[PDB]
Amino acid sequence: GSAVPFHGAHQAGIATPVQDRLHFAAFDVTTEDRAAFVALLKEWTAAARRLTAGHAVGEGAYGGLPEAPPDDTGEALGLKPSRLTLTIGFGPSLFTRFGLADLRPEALADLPKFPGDNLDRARSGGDLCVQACADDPQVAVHAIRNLARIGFGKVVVRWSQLGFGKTSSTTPDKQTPRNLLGFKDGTRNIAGTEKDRLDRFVWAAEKDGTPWMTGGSYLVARRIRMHIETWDRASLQEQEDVFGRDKGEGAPVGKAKERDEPFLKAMKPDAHVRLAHPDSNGGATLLRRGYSFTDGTDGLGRLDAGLFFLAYQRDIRTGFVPVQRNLATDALNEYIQHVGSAVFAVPPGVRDADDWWGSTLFG
Amino acid sequence: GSAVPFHGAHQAGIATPVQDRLHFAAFDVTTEDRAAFVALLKEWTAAARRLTAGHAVGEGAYGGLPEAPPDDTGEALGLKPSRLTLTIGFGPSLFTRFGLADLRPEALADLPKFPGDNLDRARSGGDLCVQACADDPQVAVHAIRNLARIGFGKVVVRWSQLGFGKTSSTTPDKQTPRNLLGFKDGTRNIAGTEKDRLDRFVWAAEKDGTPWMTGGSYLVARRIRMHIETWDRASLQEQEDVFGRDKGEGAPVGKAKERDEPFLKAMKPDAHVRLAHPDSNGGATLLRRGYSFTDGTDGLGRLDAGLFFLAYQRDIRTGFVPVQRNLATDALNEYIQHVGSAVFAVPPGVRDADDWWGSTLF
Ligand code: HEM
Ligand code: HEM
């Protein structure tokens, strides 16, 4: 459990084991030159091969010419690879550049406006994303800081989010993590072991209509604030009725164990699990891979905390869109607000040492 | 994942080995009722005994009356104590309430203005603080959230700071961590095992003039922004000349190993280590216990990066103040800006199960 292989038919960081920490960054492109952007994707891919093996970028962090800036900023020296994965994605706004408008996938759909949205434009969208996941947050931050530095003059950082899940040194791998509302989160999800369910619900197929995306996936990111101080004043019964599971064991109502299959008719009609379940959505099923956040306190002394929701799917129109539409009457809506949003096409994997991020799109 | 003992002559979270994560909160007091404030300190102490042992506060996180809110918010259920420490401090502004004016320690000094200061008043000061440190960020957030909930109507959060990784060491036997400039930070500190140096430089003594503070310490907090665009285009030689140590090993200039003693005359006259060293400051020595932070982007296309600097000392006048005055000509000033400040009196330890935070003052 020290490194995750970078090369594959698929990018790592989707179906590979969930790491303890997240640094997610969205970038905007500042160049109009296609050749200069392809050169960056090749340099970024070379850096990512070094970073995911626990090596410094370029000629290293020290021991070069004294009169040159070092190639690597040095804050990860002495740390382990920490299961780092680096996953790149392309936003809809990238396809307005470089003559790409006819290669935007139909599955990379713009999201509709949903009831109760309060999206901050500054923390939404982006031409590009890099998802950096690792067990050590300094390994993740060092990766984003050095990719941003390599890209300076061709890309800028639009927005950045730090996140946390479990701490693996102290918490067993099989234990479901709790979200900041104190409920177990992830019980009924697609697991990385389920190869057929990934082919059906997560990976883009050649016959889906966009050949360059074969073996890729589609990502939806939502920054969802929780109203923590309001939630903490709710009764135990009110909290359990919102979800349709009990708080201690996380069993479905009228069942005994966390992994018992739910009986949807025993839950309240607007309970979150009942509305989100595939049987309520024509079989629509998601891979959730999100992380908790706590950024600090706002001007009223309230905790700025919530869930940085990440979902992967074969098609945004048949995954996130139908399920989020069905949450229009969710009992949870009283306690949350969606304040950031973005969608990305995540290309296929880097096949070998000579391949590079985006090679199927750019040629 | 083990517990750090909560009781002692001193509070834990100072000499204790430095934990991976920080959640620091400053609170302002909103009650004028002395008895109501004393009742809060006792309830907070009872909660801290549970939290530091990995137990839920009050009657627990579930299995109570369905129609009542749970006593514990529940997001730490099934987690280990994770070396949680909870350290309380009292700000100078507290002493204007509850008839405490004559008990303000002389050693709790207001800081002067320093050249280059750009202090945000909203994220400075505070009537009191809680430093939560743990190896698990969820355990630290759970502690601050449950203390703030218990204090509803008597205290409000003024400002908070999360630290994602440590930039300090009280354990010279373990690897020294790096700050976001890529240098080891904590080589020449005070170790938790150096009992003589802790008595000389960190713990307040009865003869210092404030009996209620005997066994306590004084805390300076400084929020420091880093100019990483400016730093990352500097040459390797410029970076090493700024500090007086090499970047790869962290050895003093000319020497082979991190822990070899500095030879100050080989460093540039404005080198950070040369200006900050005790021999440059009449023997003034600090216990540094800070953490790195990043709070998103700056809105100008760049990552935000900084260091939340924490120093403990026996007297602010003989610790932080002379060292920071000597840093007026530091080469590092080109790459940093102080943007937040606070000082606190950290009372003595909770002696046993009948004692309570602040009992020697109140
Ligand atoms: C802060 C926001 C949210 C919280 C706190 C939350 C919490 C939970 C919890 C506690 C569960 C039950 C345990 C489990 O199976 O994971 C659950 C299930 C689920 N949630 Fe949410 N959720 C949130 C937002 C969303 C959103 C935005 C979507 C999709 C658009 C979503 C889709 C689901 C799905 C599909 C399930 C599994 C239902 C099943 O098949 O049984 N959730 N969520
Ligand atoms: C962003 C701000 C700062 C950075 C990046 C930084 C960095 C460093 C580094 C790399 C070292 C050498 C390794 C070590 O012995 O710890 C060091 C030493 C030291 N720093 Fe700083 N520092 C900063 C701010 C401060 C401040 C504000 C003070 C006190 C007012 C301070 C006091 C010291 C002391 C006392 C030493 C040890 C010198 C010795 O005895 O050898 N530092 N710092």
Residue numbers in the entry:
A (entry chain B): 55 to 417
B (entry chain A): 55 to 416
Which text from the study accompanies this structure?
Dye-decolourizing peroxidases (DyPs) are oxidative heme-containing enzymes that can oxidize organic substrates by first reacting with hydrogen peroxide to yield a catalytically active ferryl heme intermediate that results in electron transfer from substrates. This enzyme displays a typical DyP active site [Figs. 2(a) and 2(b)], with a heme coordinated on the proximal side by a histidine, whereas a solvent molecule is bound at the distal side. Complicating description and interpretation, the asymmetric unit of DtpAa crystals contains two molecules that show considerable differences in structure.
In view of the ∼1.6–1.8 Å distance of the two atoms, we propose the ligand to be either a ferric hydroperoxo intermediate (Fe–OOH−, also referred to as Compound 0), in line with previous investigations on chloroperoxidase, or a peroxo ligand. Wilson plots calculated from the calculated intensities after the final stage of refinement are not affected by these complications; they solely reflect the falloff of Bragg diffraction with resolution (as the atomic model only accounts for this and not for other effects), and modern refinement programs calculate Icalc on an absolute scale. Icalc-based Wilson plots for the ID29 100 × 100 µm and the Cristallina-MX 100 × 100 µm data are shown in Fig. 12(b); a clear difference in the falloff of Bragg intensity with resolution is immediately apparent. To check that these are not spurious effects due to a difference in unit-cell parameters, we refined the 100 × 100 µm ID29 data using the 100 × 100 µm Cristallina-MX cell and found a change of only 0.03 Å in either parameter, much smaller than the effects seen with the actual data sets. Moreover, we observe an increase in the FeOOP displacement for the ID29-derived structures compared with those from the XFEL data, which is also much larger for the B molecule than for the A molecule.
